[PDB]
Amino acid sequence: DNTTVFTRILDRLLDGYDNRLRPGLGERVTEVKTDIFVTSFGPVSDHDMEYTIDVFFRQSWKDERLKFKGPMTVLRLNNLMASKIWTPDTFFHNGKKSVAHNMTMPNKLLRITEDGTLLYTMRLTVRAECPMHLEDFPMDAHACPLKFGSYAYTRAEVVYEWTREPARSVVVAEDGSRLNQYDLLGQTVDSGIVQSSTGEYVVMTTHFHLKRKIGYFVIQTYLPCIMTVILSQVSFWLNRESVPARTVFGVTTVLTMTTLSISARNSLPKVAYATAMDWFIAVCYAFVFSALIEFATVNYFTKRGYAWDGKSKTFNSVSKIDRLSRIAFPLLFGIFNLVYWATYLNR
Amino acid sequence: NMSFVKETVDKLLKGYDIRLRPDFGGPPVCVGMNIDIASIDMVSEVNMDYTLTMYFQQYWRDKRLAYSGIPLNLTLDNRVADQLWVPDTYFLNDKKSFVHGVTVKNRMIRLHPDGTVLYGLRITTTAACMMDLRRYPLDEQNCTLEIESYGYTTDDIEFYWRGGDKAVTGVERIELPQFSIVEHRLVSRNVVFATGAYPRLSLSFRLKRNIGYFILQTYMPSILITILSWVSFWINYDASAARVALGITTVLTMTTINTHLRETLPKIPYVKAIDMYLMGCFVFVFLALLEYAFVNYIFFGRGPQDVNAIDRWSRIVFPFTFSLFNLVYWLYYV
């Protein structure tokens, strides 16, 4: 008997049902209460200024035409009937190429209750557009939005809500971090209005707050560039008669900074300005450049070719431009690290 | 009413032929267009294209969809666009494009009571524009978007920008990473092909490349390596192991700049303005090491048969000629 009643309920719901028109097209607005469960805040692409997110995207609204009376109170539907029932045209305002999964069946469920309330969830993969301000790279933090709303229906036709308190609506899974470069600090849920050429739409908004971990860039970029500058200052404690040695020591630290400037440059999208790591490399390239101009000034005032033999004619003296540069250049690089790591670990 | 609205719409699409143009034997239909650009995603110099996300909207008057009694603009489902006549407009620059289909296919049909119809589309197109990169990276680029009717000629369909010059919006909100939009323009004209004369609309930008990226990476170390090649002029000629190890390591550093920028800059195989500066700086590094062997051959090879004069001469000429080379370079490409 139950297999006969259930098929006759699903036949009489679609009699006279026009899915082309909104529930209450001239009567009232359609309050669509939305709800998001984030299962993986996927990998954020810095060079594309985008990120990926896997959601169970829930929707709930009331349709008067789908009331029924039967044995059960809630129905479950195959998606052939979910394509015959009206569905709000939610799109993502910053989506780039998002995927509605259908393995192995289309991952959608539509549930009718006896009073007409529809529950419509889907499993999505949304590739959204996150604008980034990389002036403080890598010691920066930016909020990636996930903004959605109706496509054709204005504020006078379809209004979106949340199914509960807005901070409790967007839920992130505890094991669903799935980030390796950033650190998901928490989300913020809000709601807004666009002024399009067609009309005013209701926009739900979720911002995900990300702070970049800088432990990779210290070992790969900062510490070899610090230790190369420490090298090019250590040639000051060599004797002034080491004319091949302090030349060989000087230019090879420049080629080492040239090697480190290339590999640090590849791990960055091509912004139009100086990132915070680029302020560090260009100044560290200047301490290595100026350490060889120091030896070009010492060599101009040497006046001899031989050095101090260990058993003792007249000899050279340790120059004033060497004894000053032993004090000046480690200090001006030490003062620069105090200015750099306090300006950018404050912002 | 709500049940009356179904009976109104069902008799609009009863007997409606989607194969026929509106006024199929009469006047040409006038389609007015409207683009709300969401974002210009990336501008690639290798593939010679740019990605464009936009809200592409079209308005035309259809007498077969005139409904009376209902004082509201019927905004229907997106699936009724498969049961109407929509224009067959395309893009000539279009390499690859798609209408967004999450959560549904992002279309709209907003009927009006006089017969006016809006058909919006959120399209992410990859439009192709060729670039004159002979002034890279000090260049301006003009990338277009051509909009044309495919089958219908200018006797069947007619295009116009709806709103005049305020048709395309959202260009001032675009903040490209390494470019800067100077001015966008709107062009309406008719183009004759081998089949007929078709109407064409053109949206076209003017991209100016920002230069702060390439000074820190490409120009400034290539300058400071040439200056370190001049250090072998204030060193005595007897320092053979010192004056060689400057200029030999200096031609190696210019090699590792040029070869690793070839792997870092976009690969476009012809001669650019950055290639002539890096080859131009490589010569001053190459000539400064020729200066020592010209000194080393005179004192020792043609010695037992002036030496300080050539080192004194090169301290003035090579900083002057390289500053003269920058004056030729930074005035020709600016």
Partner: nanobody, 108 residues
Framework: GSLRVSCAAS????????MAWFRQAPGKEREFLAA???????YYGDSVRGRFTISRDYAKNSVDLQLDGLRPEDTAVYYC?????????????????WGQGTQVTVSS
């Protein structure tokens, strides 16, 4: 009566940034009023929703605020904020650029 408080920026293109409007009565409480994002998305505080109208101009690098339906409770100093909202869009600690102040006085 209506009013239109504007905010002309300088020195930096704030198209990417969120340009907001705050409010501080005597009592030291920075209150959110409105904020428009880069994609022309109008956020509003629930006390001034439906009354104030924010409207950025992106070619001139400015943010406006169409004050309408004013009351003597709206008599305060209106700060023009700008910056990317990190833990933001309702919080003053996310806005790193600030306006001077505009004493809007309403007397019934």
């Amino acid at each position: 009566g209506s009013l239109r408080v504007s905010c002309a920026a300088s020195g930096r293109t704030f198209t990417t940034y969120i340009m907001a409007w705050f409010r501080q009565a005597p009592g030291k409480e920075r209150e959110f009023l409105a904020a428009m994002d880069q994609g022309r998305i109008q956020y509003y505080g629930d006390s001034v929703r439906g009354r104030f109208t924010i409207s950025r101009d992106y070619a001139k690098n400015s943010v406006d605020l169409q004050l309408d339906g004013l009351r003597p409770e709206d008599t305060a100093v209106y700060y023009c904020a700008a910056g990317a909202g990190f833990w933001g869009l309702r919080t003053a600690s996310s806005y790193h650029y600030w306006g001077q102040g505009t004493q809007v006085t309403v007397s019934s």
